[PDB]
Amino acid sequence: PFTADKGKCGLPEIFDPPEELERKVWELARLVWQSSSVVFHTGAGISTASGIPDFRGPHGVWTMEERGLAPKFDTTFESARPTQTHMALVQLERVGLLRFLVSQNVDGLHVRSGFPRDKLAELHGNMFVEECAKCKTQYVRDTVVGTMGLKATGRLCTVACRGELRDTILDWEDSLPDRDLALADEASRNADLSITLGTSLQIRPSGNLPLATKRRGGRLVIVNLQPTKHDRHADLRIHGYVDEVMTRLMKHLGLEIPAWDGPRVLERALPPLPRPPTPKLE
Numbered sequence: 001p002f003t004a005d006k007g008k009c010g011l012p013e014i015f016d017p018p019e020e021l022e023r024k025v026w027e028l029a030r031l032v033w034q035s036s037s038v039v040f041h042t043g044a045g046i047s048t049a050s051g052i053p054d055f056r057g058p059h060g061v062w063t064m065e066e067r068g069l070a071p072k073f074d075t076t077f078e079s080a081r082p083t084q085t086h087m088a089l090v091q092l093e094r095v096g097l098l099r100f101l102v103s104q105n106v107d108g109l110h111v112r113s114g115f116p117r118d119k120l121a122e123l124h125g126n127m128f129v130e131e132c133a134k135c136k137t138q139y140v141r142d143t144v145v146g147t148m149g150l151k152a153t154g155r156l157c158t159v160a161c162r163g164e165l166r167d168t169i170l171d172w173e174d175s176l177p178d179r180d181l182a183l184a185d186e187a188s189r190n191a192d193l194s195i196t197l198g199t200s201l202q203i204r205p206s207g208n209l210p211l212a213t214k215r216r217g218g219r220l221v222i223v224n225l226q227p228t229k230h231d232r233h234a235d236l237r238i239h240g241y242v243d244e245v246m247t248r249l250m251k252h253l254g255l256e257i258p259a260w261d262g263p264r265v266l267e268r269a270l271p272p273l274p275r276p277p278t279p280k281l282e
């Protein structure tokens with residue numbers, strides 16, 4: 001924990017100028033239109049505009065620690081609202097343009113946004129989620145589960161079990177959940193487009209999954225203000241605020257970003273809603 005490798009922290013931000021930013025989000029739209037199977041990979045960068053500081057940005061948890069400063073939260077995890085980017089990802093799944101969502105975020109915001117859990121891999125856990133050791137039944141709580149590191153929460157399974165409920169927050173030494181990692185790897189490998197949003201891609205294996213898309217001629221788009229570990233491997237790197245990128249993209253795709261009704265859990269994805277017809281491309 002103390003010596004744990006926190007990676008490259010506080011690298012300078014890159015800002016694509018407006019003309020170039022506009023061009024690259026139109027190119028992103030084209031890649032989304034052309035793709036049979038789109039997988040999104042999300043990290044701390046997608047929750048910064050809700051007041052949750054990232055890890056390795058200029059004011060990241062780890063960056064600030066490295067300079068002897070403190071991170072600053074503008075929300076609690078319970079009062080955090082899903083961003084435009086979160087709500088855009090809900091809509092893209094609803095209209096069938098998102099096959100799978102792989103997240104490193106423990107903030108519970110994808111679940112609470114109404115994103116279907118059967119299309120979500122939560123690689124590092126979910127702070128609102130506790131799991132029964134005996135029957136592996138998961139409980140999505142309305143409050144943060146008070147422990148980390150897969151500890152006993154003090155609550156017992158209510159399954160028609162009295163099993164010990166434990167948090168789902170990995171500590172440094174913990175293996176990733178095999179179900180989430182298995183499904184994330186399968187999605188990434190079979191995707192012909194992987195789009196990274198607000199991740200520096202420094203954590204193995206989470207950060208390596210988008211590269212798996214590149215096998216058998218898949219395309220990789222990295223959306224990030226800072227450089228990322230796999231920048232060289234990207235077909236497209238967009239240096240801009242993920243909210244500006246996702247709003248411009250939804251506008252290109254002719255989709256509205258849906259209203260957040262407040263914290264809501266959806267276990268299973270629906271058949272796709274209607275979507276606009278595809279533009280002519282070539």
Ligand SMILES: Nc1ncnc2c1ncn2[C@@H]1O[C@H](COP(=O)(O)OP(=O)(O)OC[C@H]2O[C@H](O)[C@H](O)[C@@H]2O)[C@@H](O)[C@H]1O
Pocket residue numbers: 042043044045046048049054055056057060104105106124197198199200201202203223224225226227240241242243
């Ligand atoms: N609004 C924004 N728009 C675009 N990029 C942004 C924005 N805000 C931040 N960024 C970028 O978002 C990126 C966030 O990168 P990192 O902070 O490493 O977060 P991770 O998800 O990859 O951390 C992985 C794990 O590491 C931890 O130990 C935990 O275990 C994590 O789950 C930066 O490069 C920012 O430039």
Ligand SMILES: Nc1cc(Cl)c(S(N)(=O)=O)cc1S(N)(=O)=O
Pocket residue numbers: 043044045047052053054055061104105106107108127
């Ligand atoms: N950015 C961030 C910072 C912290 Cl400190 C935590 S944690 N360890 O308190 O869950 C979680 C996140 S996020 N939004 O990536 O889930």
Ligand SMILES: [Cl-]
Pocket residue numbers: 075076077078144
């Ligand atoms: Cl909190």
Ligand SMILES: [Zn+2]
Pocket residue numbers: 132133134135136137157158159161162163
């Ligand atoms: Zn149980």
